[PDB]
Design a binder for this molecule. Sequence first.
Ligand code: ADP
Ligand code: ADP
Lengths: 145, 146
Amino acid sequence: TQLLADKLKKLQVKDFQSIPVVIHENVSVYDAICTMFLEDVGTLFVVDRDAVLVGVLSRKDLLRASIGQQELTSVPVHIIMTRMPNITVCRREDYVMDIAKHLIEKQIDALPVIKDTDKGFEVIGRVTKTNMTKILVSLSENEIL
Amino acid sequence: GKTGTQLLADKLKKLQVKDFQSIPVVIHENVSVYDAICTMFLEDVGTLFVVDRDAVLVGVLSRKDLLRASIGQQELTSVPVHIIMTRMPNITVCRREDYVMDIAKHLIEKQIDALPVIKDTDKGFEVIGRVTKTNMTKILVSLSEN
Ligand SMILES: Nc1ncnc2c1ncn2[C@@H]1O[C@H](COP(=O)(O)OP(=O)(O)O)[C@@H](O)[C@H]1O
Ligand SMILES: Nc1ncnc2c1ncn2[C@@H]1O[C@H](COP(=O)(O)OP(=O)(O)O)[C@@H](O)[C@H]1O
């Protein structure tokens, strides 16, 4: 059954990514939490003015913040975001299997799908445990490839 | 089925929760929102299950449930979690003998991350395990290594 595993290891992000949810880095912690409920997501991708990736913000970053009791309404998200270097990203041609393992090796719920531009790492989707769970329902229902 | 991907599908459909579950992380219903937020970081989970004086399921709590609460206009941080829990009977649960992929549809269709695994007792559901999207993602990985 090794060529079957081979073939799964070649499913690509292109086909299984969700949209990106992004915020500007100069947005407040309060505003980012708001966006989190409006978009009903679990991770936000933080961008700079033009509009390259610069960090990420999970439910736990924000909860940590709101329990910290700084002036939330004034406090910009670059203060608390997880920053570049230093985020696990992927690209549309990356294999979902690899991505699944990163999500496990690194215990995070989502990766950003970036694109190498003449601006930098721009954000063009996400891939998350939900995507993985969907790919896993699709296979059990024999609906892939 | 006739094909490789069909046989793969066939085994996927036969996997039961009992073999793909994580420990339950469980709090009492008279604990504060603040304590819940702490337990949540301590145990490093995204869903706490809430039980009563008899150890019987009474609700769930997600990370966003507690985020919403901790920034409510009203002070909700000091209040008991039963004020703010998603209550029974509108919690979706599962049992050891349930098929994993039946549970994967529920996670997706109902748009939740975890289902408590429970045991029927004459007094209600006893929490005996956790099933989440992390469990699900591990099964995918295993497909590629195994
Ligand atoms: N793609 C990522 N790359 C690097 N770090 C991340 C990434 N996504 C989240 N993180 C950080 O790692 C932690 C894990 O958060 P995550 O697993 O998404 O959910 P949560 O914090 O809601 O339980 C958070 O501190 C988050 O900011
Ligand atoms: N197993 C469940 N059954 C019923 N409701 C749940 C269950 N798990 C979570 N919920 C509720 O559904 C909403 C979404 O939960 P979930 O996706 O798990 O976390 P979050 O709110 O961080 O996105 C929350 O209000 C939570 O109380």
